[PDB]
Amino acid sequence: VADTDASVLILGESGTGKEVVARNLHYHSKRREGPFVPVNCGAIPAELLESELFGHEKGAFTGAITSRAGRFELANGGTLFLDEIGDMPLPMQVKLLRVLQERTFERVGSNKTQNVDVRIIAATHKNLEKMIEDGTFREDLYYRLNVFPIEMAPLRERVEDIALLLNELISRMEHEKRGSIRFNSAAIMSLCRHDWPGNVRELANLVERLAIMHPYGVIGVGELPKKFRHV
Amino acid sequence: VADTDASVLILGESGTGKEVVARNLHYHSKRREGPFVPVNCGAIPAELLESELFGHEKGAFTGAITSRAGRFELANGGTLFLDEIGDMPLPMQVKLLRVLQERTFERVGSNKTQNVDVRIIAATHKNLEKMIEDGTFREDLYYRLNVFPIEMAPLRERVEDIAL
Amino acid sequence: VADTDASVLILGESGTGKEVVARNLHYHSKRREGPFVPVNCGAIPAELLESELFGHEKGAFTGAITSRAGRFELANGGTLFLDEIGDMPLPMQVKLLRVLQERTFERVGSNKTQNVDVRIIAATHKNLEKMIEDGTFREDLYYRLNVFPIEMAPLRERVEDIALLLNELISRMEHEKRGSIRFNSAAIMSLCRHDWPGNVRELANLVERLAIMHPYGVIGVGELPKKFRHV
Amino acid sequence: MHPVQVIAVTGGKGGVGKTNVSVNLALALADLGRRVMLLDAALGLANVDVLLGLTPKRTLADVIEGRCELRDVLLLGPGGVRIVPAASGTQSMVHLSPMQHAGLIQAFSDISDNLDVLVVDTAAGIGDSVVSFVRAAQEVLLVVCDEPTSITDAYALIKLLNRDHGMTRFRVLANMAHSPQEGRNLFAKLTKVTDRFLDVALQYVGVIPYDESVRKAVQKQRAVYEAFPRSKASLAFKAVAQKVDSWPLPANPRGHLEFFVERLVQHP
Amino acid sequence: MHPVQVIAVTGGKGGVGKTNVSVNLALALADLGRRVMLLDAALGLANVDVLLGLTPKRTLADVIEGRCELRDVLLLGPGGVRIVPAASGTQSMVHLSPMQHAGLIQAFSDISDNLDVLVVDTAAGIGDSVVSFVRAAQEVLLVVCDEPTSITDAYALIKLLNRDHGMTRFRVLANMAHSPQEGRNLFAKLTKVTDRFLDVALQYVGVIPYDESVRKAVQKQRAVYEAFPRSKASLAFKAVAQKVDSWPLPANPRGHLEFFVERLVQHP
């Protein structure tokens, strides 16, 4: 997908690291000079998602003292990263499909159509098909987006990868002069036998916690938190 | 316009009698056996116009105990009379233009597109152009509707008809 | 953890002494000379939390009659202790995450962005992980606040410390001048044989109650008010 | 600069003498030598100005309606006590949103001269305004009379505060008692009920005797402390004020909204 | 079948004896031979049951929370008077929406046996609940004492009702007066203020003397009419009840919400 400008759908559980994949695709494609605008559809309130993604003009709603422009126009000539697209409501799904195909959208309080050239990299953690037979996600939108799918597996299904991830985390933590830690075989094996809900964020958070706890020392099974210890 | 199935825009002040003109066009066209469904946009609250015009399915909103179907499907094979279309908000205008051209619409709480064959006779009493330069009415919708305009004059400009 | 600038989350049960831990962390940090601003999210109505944390201008809502500084600005140069973070509403969770990430916030009814450098110490008695599982708490805010968790233990699990706590509580009453009181060995043993829900809160409440009720007295087995004797 | 002590006079039962206790306690505390501000939390119906004989040109209704700020509605009352007047039957003060109470409490932080006394005379009942003004105060003084209705009302207020806000420390003052043993017995009954159902700390403050000099003062629209400074009620108020002045000053802010959080944050 | 007379006992000032007047008037009107229902509109804090010594198993909190209907919360009180009990410090009754007050008033139409007496004991203050229960009643009886604060509060309630609801007819009853001339003078002062600022009709009902038998009855948790039926207060209540029974019955419904609109519509 790197050399092709096409809409991407990244499938993976929460915390797998989809934003870095989106940034890697953006900065090494024809958009590398274009803006990268990340938006989390779960952060904006449902009543403000329209104004956030499309923008609004003067007096659009009570509190619209300025003509703030939306995320799509900020991503013109760049890439817009939709994260957890599954909670986005149905009318907004129809307008997103309109942006994807008809390359047009409407501001809030405006009576004109605007054309923007953006690349949409969508991310979600819900089974979109099951939502389709539940009557909650748009089926046509699902086919439009799942042309180039990236399935990012949980860390509990690639446990033998933990050592390399620890090397990368500790390497960055050393580059920023924030300390270093070292594990023995027992600690790494114990970590490999963990369920890891919140995979990579759990791993990074644990690394930071251990750097605070045991700086410049050897980490064993005893020095790991109780929830990580295993026999 | 009687022998042609095309969208009609009736321009006139309030109380000029646009409903009877719409009924005359409907009952003497190819829709004579089809339903005639009148809807006054100003009557439905602005928060319920979506559900009233397009319908909704189970649990669409708090209070949706039934899957009531909208006005457009009731007018399938007939005519829908939009009265005072000028107060209808902009997103509704975009969806109305979509119904007019693409012949498709979406219910509330539904994830499928429905096709209906209806004839739209729009009525308004506001200067739609002045609303266009005021940034309140859709300009493309105005061109789509004003292909067959009927300008119903006020009684004060046709006073010699009062006897009849 | 006290010598570093990191987000601390204090986990335990109700009345386990989290504010004491937070104050000790603040006093043994680089921010000793700064302020300590506590915020209880379960003692402020949901509609008031935003105005209390961020401040407001002269007119922002139907009750704002003056412009005041919020508790983020009050904590500038110090630490902000958010107690009972679990009952914070979800929109306020989103806004708190945005403030913590961007390090900037805006008063309600204002468009001027202000920067504040504060240390966040949050406290919880609810099982957060279960709350993310039910979707009543945000996982991203959770992992921003959980850089260093400190788990406090119930008084029923540290029964041998009750006498020392009693002496400490009586000690602080010498400084806050509401009297003094002494205990008997049988009374201490009876207290040690108690379940103690709301551990330190009930211990302090009982000591206050017995001090005001019988000042400068001695407490026997029958001196205790109710449900504190154990055969 | 110092923390400011805030005293909320309450009790739930109407006609127990909350306003009289507030005014006379403020006057006595000013007599001991403190700069005292008295706030009439009876926002819909003003009685502090009526008892003191004041006719304010501008009240808190002007503050909430925005015609004037908070500093210019202060009145110099008897004994040097500064009074914040409330409205009397104004349509904009009958019932206020919690947001408005929060704004009014927060706006009091503009005042930085009083010597750690701010007496808040709450309204009758256990309503939202009363609870809001009690929770914002460091000390909660309950005025109770030796009647089953007054005991029940005070117990209900204590139960509400303890159950829904976790308060455990309450001060109790007996009013219109015909003997000191009457006040002691009234405290015994109230503590008996609370002990039987709750786990809270009640501290006896004192007793204000039934005195007709108070009635003459009310008829004269002046305060019993200044109109009849040698009466039994005046001496009881002086004793209570001496006891109140010995209360421990606040030292640490709490998580909820309260008066003068600025002084509780910066000073430590 | 007949229209039902509804009497709202009010006065704004707390501790003027609204509950005592309500209870004793109810028992006296039952003595004259009417089927009387007494409602404790003090929804957050119940005092009718306290003064009468009742311990209800189900109260109005159970009605609003939906555990039971309205008929099964009735209690047979002294003298055959049927009591509707209120809650005491229940979180679901501290403050209710106007919709809830409307529903509770409308639900009373299920009762079709009382002989045109329904006494409504409003709470202290001029709040929304008090105004809702006063406007829904045919007769408005204001209990006033000979104090500047009581006169000011009664005038404020009258001014509120007249300005924002157009009410013009008010009954005034003096309580805790030490002479009949005291009651006459109190009425004179109240009418002087009202005539100076308003155009309303005040009708003097009578005077209830200051009597310590009332205090003994409250201490005994019984009513002064039944505990001390030969006291001055009991005789005054009997005279007032005889005067109240001579009031004209309602004949035509008004446009707003009020008790028993059904009987006011069908009967004419």
Ligand SMILES: Nc1ncnc2c1ncn2[C@@H]1O[C@H](COP(=O)(O)OP(=O)(O)CP(=O)(O)O)[C@@H](O)[C@H]1O
């Ligand atoms: N110590 C005392 N001795 C004698 N009478 C007293 C008294 N304290 C109060 N009273 C009487 O009680 C009346 C009511 O006093 P006050 O107005 O302070 O009570 P309160 O604050 O409970 C009224 P509300 O509840 O409406 O605010 C006084 O005007 C007086 O008649």
Ligand SMILES: Nc1ncnc2c1ncn2[C@@H]1O[C@H](COP(=O)(O)OP(=O)(O)CP(=O)(O)O)[C@@H](O)[C@H]1O
């Ligand atoms: N005529 C009278 N003589 C003696 N005492 C009287 C009296 N009228 C009322 N009282 C006393 O007034 C006190 C309060 O009476 P009551 O409870 O009826 O008042 P109220 O209902 O107006 C207070 P609230 O409005 O706050 O509920 C009691 O001590 C009662 O005995």
Ligand SMILES: [Mg+2]
């Ligand atoms: Mg008062």
Ligand SMILES: [Mg+2]
């Ligand atoms: Mg009462």
